Design a protein around this nucleic acid. Structure first.
Ligand code: SF4
Lengths: 1145, 261, 261, 261
DNA sequence: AGGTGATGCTTTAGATTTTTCAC
DNA sequence: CAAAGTGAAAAATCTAAAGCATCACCT
């Protein structure tokens, strides 16, 4: 009560004095000041009326660096809708029960989206309860959540106004977001701020024209930690060496000299002409002198940005442990406190981590998310490394190595942040009104959620409640569903193997399809001109010339359709294909309308220019239980009691249990009943359903992403324009013009990269529970439209080439050499003197608009007269990335089925453009297979005949398999240890799983026998192990010999391995003699068969190597096709009679 | 109003089960000559032929020249419901929806009826070329079927020769080669066990071992087996089921494609 | 302590082979009269009631009527050592820790001892209602198991139609439908193949096939099984051997899904 | 010319069938004295032996000695060709890269010739430890196989013990433990069912069971087995083949830790 | 020495479950 | 009291569904 109030007050005052310690003054004098935001944070500041007043704070700087802040209070609120005629009394009783919490009660109608009579002009009326603090909000929402839960429970089943309220909303999304959208505040932009007394709220305005913006103070500290061998690295055991850090180009370093042997001097790291960071050395005799010198250095810094990767798991608990050993108070010193979900939020500073962007939102290879790999990707040059096992002695022998390593790592960290992550924060501060930490941490799906809130309040529509997952789904026959999904990613690879463009291959074409192209060559080119660049034909000068060139080349392909010629690897990529199709058909989540509610609309004219007959298939994975036996088992459940979930509580009854344990009871009982009853518990079928979609709603998602795609195109166009301007100014050399033009081009690059990320985020919103617009058909219908497109491409290129991979949004493919691919059209127009046109994308575009010109595109031209102007639009634009030199396609082990979504490509120079889906980018598991993957990916690019390429891959495979077939006697054992180190995590304790059998549980049992239960007392253990072979007649999960046994002294270590081995006869116990090759050999065999053997066998290569065997299903067909005794059709030997059809009896 | 009953239900059981692993939808037809089956595999290789005499049935009332194309897996599953020594009758109508089969036992108590739904498909029909074939053997059924079963795993391709010495079947694979040689029989009175040959010209051909393996499940249909073949000619192996009718079978051979010289 | 020993090794062997898969756990509540095996089935619909009396044994000594019980799987695994006429011998104590299973040869040479860890259960005692049965049939075991296997691969819901003449089973399968006809047998000499029917009222109940297939695993018990039922009551299957006891098999009737009307 | 004539057919194919799961590749020193088998097993924990000398054969021509090698699974699948009554002959040559096998039917019209592309081997040969054997169990191997497979269902390993009271075949399992006891036959007139254990000293030793089961796959060639053994030596489970030859299997003792904790 | 089916002994394809990746 | 997962791999292990090699009568 009052103790909580004074606790919150003293917390507020502590945070306030803490905040003013680091600059950011309390702006309390009247006046108007220019401002440029960096971060936001909520707090409590006492009001003019003595009430504990919750607020938020905005942190602004200027060009000089004037660090100040302003407090923003607003009443917390949420909306409630009841039945019709139950809003006034609800407001009255809520006002008279929530006094001291609610400031005022107001009726704010908001526009529904999921409602019958959809946007006929009816607006649902909500009630809005303006509270005081977020803590009162929490206690009120906990008071109301089971009340509204039971209210909707009788609503499902079928007085007081507490029952009439039937919805709570925006409860998952906290106060930051709705205050951010309430005042239209968009972060990190130039705003004008004016304080006019405490009696009036501080007013903030958006200044729009000032796109020029400064650089805030940054910190890029570079950590290093000595770790004892066979130990988790921690601050309590060992001690720090030094620190170096970078500020806006200028860097420093602070170095503890008690363990550092020698003093150090200034370093420079300039590997690039536009890269430069100067340093300065501060050397500290004491580790306390280290930590203080760093802390007063950041005291004088007035710091706002302090970024190092993976801070919230290895640096901030580390540093607070360091301060706790010395007794230093971190909360007073800075304020770095553990978050409720395992981070260290800074109320005065900003701490990022690139692992929240290089691993997730950079769309790079996942396993190459390390900072050296990030540098080799983006900077292009990998910095120096160290082994954490032996870096303690490396530090003690020489400190200059760690000094150069840390300064290089820090300056690379700054360059990675500046070139990519400041664009990202500006990118996401453009319109998404979020503070950057939860921008990085929360997903791009939540970013799309944020955009939905932004344009929803611009639409002034209500936010849908984030739905809960409901079990016991019942179909039309009331049939129990197990798990629901779609038809899935229609991902198929037709052929497989090596495909290098310069190395020639075989083509077998159809001249009929070539003539089919020929009658519409000119129509293709015309549609390419007037619809891509909106450029008419009459401006084009040499249209006839390129037309005749196309005729000549296509006839030069047409005359001999079966040839051996150099492949042309072209990717039929269509990025943002999803919202393109939603643009074509105006696909809205609550325009998702069934016919029984399509008739509820007022546009069901016989001239059906508004109903789209969209078809889709529903996958059904369901329980065989019927309605009747479900009734019997539910009556048997509710007839008696249950064991209590309450420890030593009353007997547990059905009618007051919660939902999930009842679902568990139901699934177990039906599962084993049908296991003994129906032979299967999961039955797979793919039905078909037909459901149209409406078109005339607010279309906020549709027109929002259309506006975003137009902004994409114009931002990219201005990106080329201003980068040409920047280059020309570089040959000019005037400093002001070049610096403002770099500002403009990084602005445009920021925007385009932003909206590339968001178009990569649109599709993923709907297959996740607890969202605004969960769907079961939206992504389904769009992937069916895309499936139709890619199938039609597969027959089309099936006539005119070879389709390699049918991957959702991109179709990797190959073309003949003389195929028309790109043509430049010289025009008389001054603005575009020459127009470059890619032929295959153009002809696919005319195909997809011949099949898919949506004539139902209707726009609300006049909202007053409800005018819906029907028109026809085309937008289905494809693209082909630069011709790829290489194309590799792996296959699978089993019969007739290959890998899906797994492949790799290479540019003309052979750069690592794209590689994904393999274990080599998968963390954990086995690592030696990862390193053979790395070696063979390096060895792919050599060669000019595919036989010699396969021979070189065979040579590197022969090397790395004769490494292990020679038992590695003449080579050391540590890298062997890290190669064979198989690690499987303990998600629960050893005693939790119990009777479950796995290699992890067996390893935990071996640890329990070795060092007692103290090593296996909890979960999260990095249980490292290998596999043993000497034990015979034993399951492979059994005998999971751990690596932790190696710490024991040789008599006890031997005795334990006799105990686990059940054989005391052995006397020499080398680790090579305790291996079990069989799991290693089967792992490498599966990998090799997936990567090289099966695709080469498919590519008429006699073997990759005689050291691998093959599944014998392909062996039969190869040995029969290697002989002249082919199969014979009936018709040539046997005469025919005619086709006969059987009729109904 | 079509009726056809046969006393030897067992021979019907075995003939309808021994057509399984090459065809899923047979082409059964009913005419004045009896009931006849001609069906060709889904993998466009081989043809099977079955004919039955009208008098082979105890009663055979063919009211119309009706052909029925029905599935085979469920046909044999509902077929195996019958016991070994039980009488079988087949019923069909000028217009209906479902084939009718009634199973009756000699103890006149274990009597069962069944209702099999009819389906509709369009199928190809192939002509039968009849010409003078080089060699006709009169081989015991169990011995030839045993040869088919045992030579199944020496390889997947079998070559077959006929001579004055007799008949030889030679097959080989990656592991090795095996050949079986048959002489002629004169010192035995039981012609079912006896083997006799005729010859017109030398025969050195080869056939699909695997399809003969899947077909050879018709062993006890006839006590002996007779064959007939020539070069680039249909293989005619036929199983004469007494005066009931006969089974026949047609196979695609292998021809040696010419090479450069 | 507890002691019993009997010479017929086949009887309990096939009893355990019948009861091994249908029920996992049962309570062995021995008394002065003997033991009674009722089991709360994991299916929770098909109840079982086994009775065992003491006159059939050669020795039967016990000190206290223990309400013990063990898993039937381990019992099947340990009596799988038993043959046909090997003398079965069992020893036990007043406390439930380890049983002794002894098998003695008919030719007095082979002996054995086996030990098993016991377990403690808590199963409430189900009632075994006794009533008059409107229809009873003494069904010979072999062809009843045959018709269960007959409709097993064909249908998943067998109807029973017990009439004055006999009983009729039909079903509705994906491939089709059919029926089997039963009646009294009068002229048959062997009564184990004879079938007789008690009737008071025709009872129509639809039933799962392969559950009865689990129950028909008791076919080597006797050549003839007793099958009894009435209206609106679970059916009872009665198996009888020697003067040993009786097994009652209480299977609840699944009604027609009435949601369609 | 490495010739061998012999009347029987079932015995050779079944003794090579006996090695289907224990040896995939072995050594056959085809000598003038005969042919012999001796190798490690696949897991290299046991010794196998098959002896087959010249005077068993009808005619047996062999000038030099050649130690050939063949995949046991391959020729085992090949040796399932002729019947058990078939009379068998095998020969080889100086360049015997392939075997030359003929199956000839008893009625002398169905003759088949077989060949197999061979492969060489290099597995070290060791001398069998020959010494006095303390205990031998001359008991019919069918019962031995039955009981060992029966206890294999409950037990994983065995404890052999032949003391002055009799033979104890103990077997501890995770579910339960069991032991097998047998004494001398006294009232059995026939000596093929009799057990006669010559008695030297009591023994308690441990061996494997699944390898013993693999050895007991080879019963139907002999009526009885000798289980020859001493203290701390591998078991000698000897099967008499015929007058043709014999065979020995040597299973290693399980070295349990005799020391205390 | 074969003809009807039991009866069991391998064999092979799903079934199921648990981490652990990509989206 | 808390917590953004679910298809796909891949195997371990647990299964059942058959394929096929011996037996209960009978001259
Ligand atoms: S498709 Fe047309 S008729 Fe149907 S709901 Fe939408 S606007 Fe109304």
């Amino acid at each position: 009560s009052s103790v909580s109030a004074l606790k919150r007050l003293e917390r507020s005052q502590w945070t306030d004095k803490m905040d003013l310690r680091f600059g950011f003054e309390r702006l309390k004098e009247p006046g108007e000041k220019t401002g440029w935001l960096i971060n936001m944070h909520p707090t409590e500041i006492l009001d003019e009326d003595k009430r504990l007043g919750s607020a938020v704070d905005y942190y602004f700087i200027q060009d000089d660096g004037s660090r100040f802040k302003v407090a923003l209070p607003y009443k917390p609120y949420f909306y409630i809708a009841t039945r019709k005629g139950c809003e006034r009394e609800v407001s009255s009783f809520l006002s008279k029960k929530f006094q001291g919490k609610i400031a005022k009660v107001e009726t704010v109608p908001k526009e529904d989206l999921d409602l019958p009579n959809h946007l006929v002009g009816l607006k649902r009326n909500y009630i809005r309860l303006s509270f005081h603090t977020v803590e009162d909000l929490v206690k009120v929402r906990k008071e109301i959540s089971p009340a509204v839960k039971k209210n909707r429970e009788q609503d499902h089943a079928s007085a007081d106004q507490l029952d009439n309220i039937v919805d709570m909303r925006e409860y998952d999304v906290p106060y930051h977001i709705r205050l951010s959208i309430d005042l239209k505040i968009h972060v990190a932009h130039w705003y004008n701020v004016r304080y006019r007394g405490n009696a009036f709220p501080v007013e903030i305005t958006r200044r729009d024209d000032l796109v020029e913006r400064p650089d805030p103070v940054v910190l890029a500290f570079a950590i290093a930690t000595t770790k004892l061998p066979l130990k988790f690295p921690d601050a309590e055991t060992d001690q720090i060496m030094m620190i170096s850090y970078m500020i806006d180009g200028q860097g420093y370093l602070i170095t503890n000299r008690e363990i550092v042997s020698e003093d150090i001097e200034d370093f420079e790291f300039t590997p690039k002409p536009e890269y430069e960071g100067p340093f300065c050395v501060f050397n500290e005799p004491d580790e306390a002198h280290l930590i203080q010198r760093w802390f007063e250095h950041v005291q004088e810094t007035k710091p706002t940005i302090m970024v190092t990767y993976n801070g919230d798991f290895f640096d901030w608990p580390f540093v607070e442990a360091r301060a706790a050993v010395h007794g230093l108070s971190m909360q007073q010193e800075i304020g770095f406190q553990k978050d409720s979900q395992g981070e260290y939020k800074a109320p005065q500073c900003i701490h990022m981590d690139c692992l929240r962007w290089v691993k997730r939102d950079s769309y790079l290879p996942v396993g190459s998310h390390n900072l050296k790999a990030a540098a080799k990707a983006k900077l292009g040059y990998d910095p120096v490394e160290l082994d954490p096992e032996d870096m303690c002695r490396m530090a003690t022998e020489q400190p200059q190595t760690l000094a150069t390593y840390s300064v290089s790592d820090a300056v690379a960290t700054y360059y990675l942040y500046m070139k990519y992550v400041h664009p990202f924060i500006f990118a996401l501060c453009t319109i998404i009104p979020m503070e950057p930490d939860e921008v990085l941490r929360k997903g791009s799906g939540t970013l799309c959620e944020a955009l939905l809130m932004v344009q929803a309040f611009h639409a002034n529509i209500i936010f849908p409640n984030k739905q809960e997952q409901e079990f016991n789904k019942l179909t039309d026959d009331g049939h129990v569903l197990d798990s629901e999904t779609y038809v899935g990613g229609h991902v198929e690879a037709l052929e497989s193997g090596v495909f290098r463009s310069d190395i020639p291959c075989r083509f077998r074409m159809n001249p009929a399809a070539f003539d089919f192209l020929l009658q519409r060559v000119e129509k293709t080119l015309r549609h390419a001109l007037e619809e891509e660049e909106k450029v008419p034909v009459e401006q084009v000068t040499n249209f006839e010339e390129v037309c005749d060139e196309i005729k000549s080349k296509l006839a030069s392909l047409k005359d001999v359709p079966s040839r051996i010629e150099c492949p042309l690897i072209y990717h039929l990529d269509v990025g943002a294909m999803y919202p393109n199709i939603i643009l074509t058909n105006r696909l809205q989540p609550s325009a998702m309308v069934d016919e029984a509610t399509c008739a509820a609309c007022d546009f069901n004219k016989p001239g059906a220019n508004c109903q789209r007959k969209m078809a889709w298939q529903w996958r059904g994975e369901f329980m065989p239980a019927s309605r009747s036996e479900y009734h019997r088992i539910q009556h048997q459940l509710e007839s008696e009691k249950f064991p209590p979930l309450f420890p030593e509580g009353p007997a547990r009854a059905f009618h007051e249990l919660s939902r999930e344990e009842q679902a568990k009871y139901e699934k177990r009982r039906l599962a084993d009943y049908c296991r003994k009853a129906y032979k299967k518990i999961h039955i797979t079928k793919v039905e078909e359903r037909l459901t149209t979609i409406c078109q005339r709603e607010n279309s906020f998602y549709v027109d929002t992403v259309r506006a975003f795609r137009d902004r994409r195109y114009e931002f990219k166009g201005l990106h080329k324009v201003w980068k040409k301007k920047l280059s020309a100014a570089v040959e000019v050399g005037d400093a002001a013009e070049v610096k403002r033009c770099k500002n403009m081009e990084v602005l445009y690059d920021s925007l385009q990269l932003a909206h590339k990320c968001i178009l990569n985020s649109f599709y993923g919103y709907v297959m996740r529970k607890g969202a605004r617009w969960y769907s079961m058909e939206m992504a389904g219908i769009v992937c069916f439209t895309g499936a139709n497109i890619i199938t039609q491409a597969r027959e089309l290129i099936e006539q005119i080439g070879r389709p390699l991979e049918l991957d959702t949004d991109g179709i990797w493919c190959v073309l003949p050499n003389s195929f028309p691919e790109n043509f430049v059209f010289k025009t008389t127009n001054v603005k575009k003197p020459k127009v470059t046109i890619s032929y295959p994308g153009a002809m696919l575009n005319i195909m997809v608009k011949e099949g898919f010109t949506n004539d139902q595109y209707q726009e609300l031209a006049e909202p007053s007269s409800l005018t819906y102007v029907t028109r026809s639009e085309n937008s289905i634009f494809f693209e082909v990335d630069g011709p790829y030199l290489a194309m590799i396609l792996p296959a699978s082990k089993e019969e007739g089925k290959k890998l899906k979504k797994r492949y790799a490509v290479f540019n003309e120079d052979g750069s690592l453009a794209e590689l994904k889906g393999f274990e080599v980018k998968r963390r954990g598991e086995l690592q030696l297979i990862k390193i053979f993957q790395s070696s063979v990916f390096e060895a792919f690019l050599k060669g000019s005949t595919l036989e010699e390429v396969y021979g070189s891959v065979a040579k590197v495979a022969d090397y790395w398999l004769d490494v292990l077939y020679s038992k590695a006697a003449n080579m050391p054992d540590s890298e062997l240890f890290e190669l064979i180190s198989e690690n499987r995590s303990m998600s629960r304790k050893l005693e939790d799983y119990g009777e479950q059998k796995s290699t992890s549980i067996s390893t935990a049992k071996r640890l329990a026998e070795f060092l007692g239960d103290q090593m296996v007392k909890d979960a999260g253990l990095s249980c490292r192990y290998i596999i043993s072979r000497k034990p015979e007649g034993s399951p492979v999960t059994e005998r999971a010999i751990p690596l932790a046994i190696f710490q024991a002294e040789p008599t006890v270590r031997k005795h334990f391995l006799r105990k686990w081995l059940k054989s005391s006869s052995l006397q020499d116990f080398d680790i090579r003699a305790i291996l079990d090759w069989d799991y290693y050999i089967e792992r490498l065999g599966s990998a090799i068969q997936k990567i090289i053997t099966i695709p080469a066998a498919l590519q008429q290569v006699k073997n990759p190597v005689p050291r691998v065997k093959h599944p014998d299903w392909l062996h039969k067909k190869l040995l029969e096709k290697n002989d002249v005794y082919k199969q014979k059709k009936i018709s040539e030997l046997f005469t025919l009679e005619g086709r006969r059809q059987v009729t109904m009896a | 109003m079509f009726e056809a009953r046969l006393v030897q239900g067992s021979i019907l059981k075995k003939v309808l089960e021994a057509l399984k692993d090459l065809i899923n939808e047979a082409c059964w037809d009913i005419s004045s000559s009896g009931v006849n089956l001609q069906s060709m595999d889904s993998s466009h290789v081989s043809l099977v032929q079955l004919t039955l005499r009208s008098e082979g049935f105890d009663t055979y009332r063919c009211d119309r020249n009706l052909a029925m194309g029905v599935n085979l897996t469920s046909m044999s599953k509902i077929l195996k419901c019958a016991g070994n020594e039980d009488i079988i009758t087949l019923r069909a109508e000028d217009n209906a929806d479902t084939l009718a089969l009634v199973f009756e036992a000699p103890n006149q108590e274990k009597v069962s009826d069944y209702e099999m739904k009819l389906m509709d498909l369009d199928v190809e029909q192939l002509g039968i070329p009849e010409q003078e074939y080089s060699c006709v053997v009169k081989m015991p059924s169990g011995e030839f079927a045993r040869i088919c079963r045992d030579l199944s795993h020496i390889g997947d391709a079998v070559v077959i020769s006929c001579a004055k010495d007799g008949v030889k079947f030679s097959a080989s694979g990656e592991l090795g080669n095996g050949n079986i040689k048959l002489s002629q029989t004169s010192n035995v009175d039981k012609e079912e066990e006896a083997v006799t040959i005729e010859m017109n010209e030398p025969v050195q051909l080869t056939f699909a071992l695997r399809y003969l393996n899947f077909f050879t499940k018709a062993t006890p249909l006839s006590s002996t087996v007779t064959l007939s073949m020539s070069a680039d000619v249909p293989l005619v192996v036929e199983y004469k089921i007494a005066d009931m009718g006969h089974l026949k079978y047609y196979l695609a051979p292998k021809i040696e494609d010419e090479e450069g010289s």
